[PDB]
């Protein structure tokens, strides 16, 4: 039984995150638990403050007409429990539920360990005989407890784009709002646990430039090549199959090359030292010790700049 | 209370994907969240436009007769929430729910990293005293937001096969529709992460054709053989037990052979160099360096052609 | 309100699988989604075909007495949605639900990669003042779509044991039916992915019978011993802790022995070649090259026969 | 509306396991699915056998007063479906539900691979104006189908401790019953898969007592030390963080010592053989070959006895 | 229908844990199952003890006004079942539910294997026309069975902060209570399983200070470096991505350095022993054997003190 009116019924929205959690990098989802604030005028139930009852009248949801606000990007329907409906004399309604959804918002892994993200909760509403348009009220959208968790991320700001998006979808017009949760990753645990060890074993790897024993040089270079696949797989595991190239994706693949030519060199510093001309072998081996740790530190700047600097 | 009529009641369908996600290669499933559009004529509730009310009349689902449309290939029942029922004067109904199912459609891993797929949502409807036949209406089936995700895949087109399939199943006739979602995989992340490294360690492996030390030649060939099991298992892990042979399945097994004979050669370039006739050893070792990287590049064409070229 | 009668009320059953899936080897379960067909005579609602209505009368489940059929081997209760109840004039009821359960049926991993299985869905019904006995009607039990999936298995035949099992259980008699789903595994992907590689690395392993360098002989035999634990664990992982011995369980343990004595030999072809009598060392080493690949191929027949041949 | 009476209302209980499953070692839980039998006298509904109806009268649960029996050790509430309520003339009620809970009972991993366990389902009932006391009736508690699964365990006996435990808890008295499920583990698959291989690689490890090449002696002893961490982690993984010491916990740590001194010896059988006095080196190396496999077999008895023998 | 009164309605709370379990370190959650005790005065239902009925009157929840107590830090809504409502003559209510939630409380991994924690359950209540304030009653909050499990932790004490926290949140005042569960970890299983083995392989690692063979010195130092990544990953796995530095996080990274310079030394005790001046090589090698095991034991004190001592 919708509210008879002369024009577009405006419904004022507002979210208040109470709990964030389980941001699943692989899945590209996260779980929220917040307040939802709705508010419209339905003069059909204005009420003679003096003639009866008191200041405001409480209603069971079954009694009044209430606008269906569905979330757009959600897995299964949202999971809500109604907190208070309060009707004011002029015919103004004050709705308040407490929901918990798992929301589906893409991420940009282009700077993976150093990335920043911007999550979206959507909210549309479908119209009938009267057009409905949503809109943000900011005192009910300061939504964010001073206790919002989200392990592994720093939460920067929850806000909404005031102007809504009004498609026509299936011979009826809908109205959509944008709620943005801005977060940056907490990279750090990434250093002592992935970054440094990935370098350490790369340095060791090419300690075999101050060595002459092919045996201890393949035992050296190959054993590290393995420990680095150990890392490649570890990282390529808590990460989805992007169709672009990650930052940690490149410097992990670049490092596959500094193993290939490393193994080239040690193999050539050999079919050149069995060939009776070590004049050259321990001439190449000498350059390696310099061209390697430079071309690395040099390409890492090229790569680093390519991603963040640009 | 079904709609008394002279013939087969036709119910016009239409899906509109709003959200795709969680295509589980192992499981052979995916999760959809879309609009469902139904529409039939039930003259039993034609309504005297002028004598009362307005243009259309809204009903609660409890009030009218509504056709049960069940999905065929789904795990547990579909998970729906009703959006609007609108009855037009002639006795025409306009149904619209918003469901979320996890659908079960097979995939063809024959070209695994370079495969294309075609997912199915099915929709049957069981008849009673009057036969029901379904059918697609295409303005309600343009179903696909310009935001449909599906990580790891490019979505090519959502459509339906207009003619339905009319079995008789259990002393009553049913009618089935085919909705097709065409996708191709985003192979790429497969290259820097699986393909190239699988080659790199294969090349290194047979660097021991320019080497004479059995010790550094088994330390060479065997350590790579291991790093390749590391890859075999990684890949054979995000993939179900097909009864056919994958593409990546072959070139991963072919590569097991280029390790076996590699280890054969180095073992024969030895019980032939301890046997006082290295005339032959460093005669075989010489061919290897050519027959190997050719027979590979050559069989890879044979294999590649066998799968895609045919 | 049960159906007053002179004798055992017979209820005719029939299952029709629509979807099979998620056979969990570890868990020993699988998920089905089928039709359930019930049918009994309840003369209490015979109906004067001519005096009113039509051929058959449809009822809401709340209206009639319906027999509770529970599944015996299920995790939580079954998950059903009712499709049509049709009462015929003589007082005959025609029930039809569509359920989805996850069923719990043991498997026999005695021939693991080459096993055949026989799954069970059970169905009992508890009696009250009148005894209930179930029984199979085969036109409603041809249950199996021509599209039944079950990744990794070939489905051989769905059927039911016509005679039911009538216990007395808790001062009331119950009646149980046996529905059998016969499947054999699709072994294959097991070959290029587990079987062959397990052999390959075993052959390589004992390439060190044509080698004299303890160092390259321990680097040889030990590195493969490792790659085989890689396989042992991979396999012992998608498999439950049977109290019997798997086929792949034996030939994976037998192969642990052909590594132990391999390492024995190479260690004895040494404290016998440092002991100034290689007359014997390269006398033992010679036999190895024959006794090994024979005792293997020979025990594999003994083992293979022991399991399948018997 | 409780049953007015002169004294403690006695409610006769009885469980009948129908399905056991998913005993989660890590979690310390298991999932049951059984019958629950309640039975009390509520004279308030004695009923004149002759004056009306028949032998017994069936009731919907809404109609009579029924005692709330809650399980004590359960995760979320139990999950029940009511099977039959039967009231006898004297005013005796016969309740029967079929529930499925996941129960939380500790285990004793002190003999891990050879342990025996004793699971508990608890059952309390809270009193009001009349005291309630529970108690076991054994014909309704022979609860255990001849088909109870529980993969990996042998089920020894389901029983109940007849005397209940009557606390006063929160200004009201409660009554608690003990149902005991006695199981012992099926150790076996533990042998071919963990125990033997853990020994095999330990023997190999100290094959380097009949060897002189430090290189092949560190390649020998260290490569096995690794394969044993492979096992340590595998086992320490399907097991919770006990604050006591497991059996398999000790003999897995003892074995870490027979690697440490192994590596000590081979390192001392070297800074004593480069030290121009091998008189001693191949004097120590000789003892090792005996003190090792004895001190092992000897401590294993000490340890084995310490755990089981005591 | 709230209780008309002159002032802030006080509602007396009290929790009684019955079951603790599934403290998920990674997730930062735990699962509780306890009693909830509420109690307020609602004179509106005072009752003439003598004129009718008895001492106290039992009510169904539908009948009286009951205050909604929601938990603040919970995933989805709490999961409750009502145990008894008892109204006393003065108009005093006695509520008692039994709930099960999974609670979300942060942890402090700063001393990881030796940490102590303090979990929180929160409880707010929203006011309407009359202000509500909560408060703890301690005879109903002795909440903790003498059987509370929580595998892996010692439970120290369950208590509540008597003074509540009274925000104004969304044009209405709320009142919040603090329930604290104090636990310390059971570190131990951490020693035989992680700590000791991490040291053992570190000692072995630098056994190559009494060795001269680069080959057996890289085979020595590198093979252990690997076994330590085995441990790094094992530990970094049952632990969330803290933005601070764990204790076990440091001494696991410090140990990465005692591998780096270890590998430095052995590589320099070589390009100094091939350069014809071993005067220095076996001069450095000599210091190593002392500076290493001292700088370790020394920094471990610095680190240990830094974390616990401060």
Render B239-285 in DSSP notation, one character per residue: S---SS--HHHHTTTHHHHHHHHHHHHHHHTTTTTTTT-HHHHHHHH
Do the beta carbons of residue A266 and residue A208 sit within 8 Å? yes
| Residue spans of alpha helices (H) in chain D | 190, 196-205, 214-235, 247-250, 254-268, 278-304
Residues E165 and E288 in one domain: no
CA E231 to chain centre: 23
Residues B180 and B194 in one domain: no
Residues D65 and D194 in one domain: no
Please report residues of A whose CB lies closer than 8 A to that of E27. Answer: 22
Question: Number of structural domains, chain B?
Answer: 2
Closest-CA distance of chain D to residue C310, Å: 22
What count of other Cβ atoms lies within 10 Å of the Cβ of residue B274? 13
- 3-state secondary structure string across E5-36: CCCCEEEEECEEEEEEEEEECCCCEEEEEEEE
CA pair distance D19, D30, nearest whole angstrom? 11
Residues B3 and B31 in one domain: yes
CA pair distance A106, D69, nearest whole angstrom? 47
This entry's atomic model was obtained through X-ray
Angle, alpha carbons C217-C218-C220 (nearest 5°): 65
Do the beta carbons of residue A99 and residue A36 sit within 8 Å? yes
Helix (H), strand (E) at residue A95? strand A92-104
Residues B194 and B181 in one domain: no
Residues A98 and A184 in one domain: yes
Q: Which residue of D has its CA nearest to E79?
A: D76
Angle, alpha carbons D76-D77-D83 (nearest 5°): 140
Angle, alpha carbons B78-B81-B87 (nearest 5°): 115
Residues C183 and C258 in one domain: no
Residues A167 and A252 in one domain: no
Do the beta carbons of residue C85 and residue C93 sit within 8 Å? yes
CA pair distance D305, C23, nearest whole angstrom? 43
CA pair distance D217, D259, nearest whole angstrom? 12
Which residue range(s) make up the domain with A214? 190-310
What count of other Cβ atoms lies within 10 Å of the Cβ of residue D38? 21
| Residue spans of alpha helices (H) in C160-212 | 190, 196-205
CATH of the domain at B166: 2.70.170.10
Do the beta carbons of residue B59 and residue B84 sit within 8 Å? no
**Interface contact B128-C200, CB threshold 8 A:** no
Domain boundary residue, one of E130, E155, E189: E189
CA pair distance E5, E173, nearest whole angstrom? 17
What count of other Cβ atoms lies within 10 Å of the Cβ of residue D79? 14
Do the beta carbons of residue A195 and residue A247 sit within 8 Å? no
Burial class (CB in 10 A: 0-12, 13-18, 19+), B84: middle
- Cα separation values, B196 from A246, A257, C33, C218, Å: 16, 11, 43, 30
> D102 pairs with which residues across the strands?
D31
**From the list C81, C188, C210, which residue is nearest B271 (CB)?**
C210
CA pair distance E111, B264, nearest whole angstrom? 53
Residues C157 and C17 in one domain: yes
Residues A17 and A154 in one domain: yes
Do the beta carbons of residue D114 and residue D129 sit within 8 Å? no
Phi, psi of B136 (to 5 degrees): -85, 130
**From the list C215, C253, C264, which residue is nearest D216 (CB)?**
C215
Reference C3, options C92, C130, C94; nearest CA is C130
Please enumerate in sequence order all residues whose Cβ is within 8 A of that of E118, keeping only pairs 6 or more positions apart, or say none. E180, E181, E182, E183
CA pair distance E14, E9, nearest whole angstrom? 17
Name the 3-class secondary structure at E279: helix
Do the beta carbons of residue C37 and residue C17 sit within 8 Å? no
Write the DSSP symbol of residue B8. P
CA A40 to chain centre: 33
Give the A window 49-108 contacts with B, CB below 8 Å: 68, 70, 72-77, 104, 106
- Cα separation values, D302 from D6, D258, E191, Å: 62, 15, 22
CA pair distance D248, D303, nearest whole angstrom? 10
Q: Which residue of C has its CA nearest to B72?
A: C18
CA pair distance D296, D306, nearest whole angstrom? 15
**From the list C27, C104, C218, which residue is nearest D19 (CB)?**
C104
Q: Which residue of D has its CA nearest to E23?
A: D27
- Cα separation values, B55 from A125, B46, B49, B284, Å: 21, 12, 6, 91
Residues E119 and E36 in one domain: yes
Residues C306 and C241 in one domain: yes
Q: Resolution in angstroms, to 1 decimal, for this deposition?
A: 3.4
CA pair distance A292, A294, nearest whole angstrom? 5
Reference E128, options A44, A96, A137; nearest CA is A96
Q: Would you tell me the crossing angle of helices C214-235 and B214-235 to the nearest 10 degrees?
A: 10
Do the beta carbons of residue D154 and residue D56 sit within 8 Å? no
Name the 3-class secondary structure at D144: coil
CA D232 to chain centre: 21
Domain boundary residue, one of C165, C189, C213: C189
Reference C209, options C271, C274, C292; nearest CA is C292
- Cα separation values, A209 from A221, B202, B210, D285, E275, Å: 10, 23, 19, 36, 14
CA pair distance C17, B101, nearest whole angstrom? 19
CATH of the domain at A222: 1.20.58.390
Domain boundary residue, one of A173, A189, A205: A189
Phi-psi region of A202 (alpha: psi -120 to 50; beta: other; left: phi over 0): alpha
Please report residues of E whose CB lies closer than 8 A to that of A223. Answer: 218, 222-223, 226
Subunits next to C (3 or more Cβ pairs <8 Å) are B, D
Please report residues of D whose CB lies closer than 8 A to that of E220. Answer: 218, 222
Flag whether residue E210 sits within 8 Å of chain D, measured between CB atoms. Answer: yes
**From the list E104, E229, E241, which residue is nearest A197 (CB)?**
E229
């Amino acid at each position: 039984p919708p509210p008879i009116a002369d024009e577009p019924l405006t419904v004022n929205t507002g979210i208040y995150l109470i709990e964030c959690y389980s941001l699943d990098d692989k899945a590209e989802t996260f779980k929220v638990n917040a307040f939802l604030s709705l508010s419209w005028k339905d003069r059909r139930l204005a009420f003679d403050p003096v003639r009866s009852g008191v200041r405001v009248k409480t209603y069971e949801p079954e009694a009044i007409w209430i606008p269906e606000i569905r979330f757009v990007n959600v897995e299964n329907a949202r999971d809500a429990d109604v907190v208070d409906i309060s009707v004011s004399p002029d015919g103004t309604v004050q709705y308040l539920e407490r929901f918990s959804a798992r929301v589906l918002s893409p991420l940009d892994f282009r700077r993976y360990p150093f990335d920043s993200q911007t999550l979206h909760i959507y909210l549309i509403v479908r119209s009938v005989d009267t057009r409905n348009i949503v809109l943000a009220v900011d005192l009910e959208k300061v939504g964010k407890n001073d206790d919002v968790f989200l392990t592994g991320w720093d939460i920067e700001s929850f806000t909404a784009v005031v102007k809504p998006a009004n498609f026509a979808l299936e011979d009826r017009l809908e109205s959509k709002l944008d709620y943005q949760l801005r977060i940056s990753r907490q990279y750090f645990s990434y250093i002592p646990n992935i970054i440094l060890p990935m370098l350490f074993i790369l340095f060791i790897s090419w300690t075999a430039f101050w060595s002459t024993s092919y045996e201890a040089n393949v035992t050296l270079v190959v054993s590290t090549l393995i420990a680095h696949i150990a890392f490649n797989i570890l990282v390529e595991t808590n990460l989805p199959k992007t169709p672009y190239m990650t930052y940690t994706g490149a410097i992990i693949f670049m490092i596959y090359l500094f193993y290939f030519v490393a193994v080239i060199e040690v193999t050539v510093q050999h079919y050149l030292k069995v060939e009776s001309q070590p004049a050259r072998a321990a001439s190449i081996t000498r350059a390696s010790r310099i061209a390697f740790p430079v071309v690395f530190l040099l390409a890492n700047i090229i790569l680093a700049f390519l991603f963040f600097g640009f």
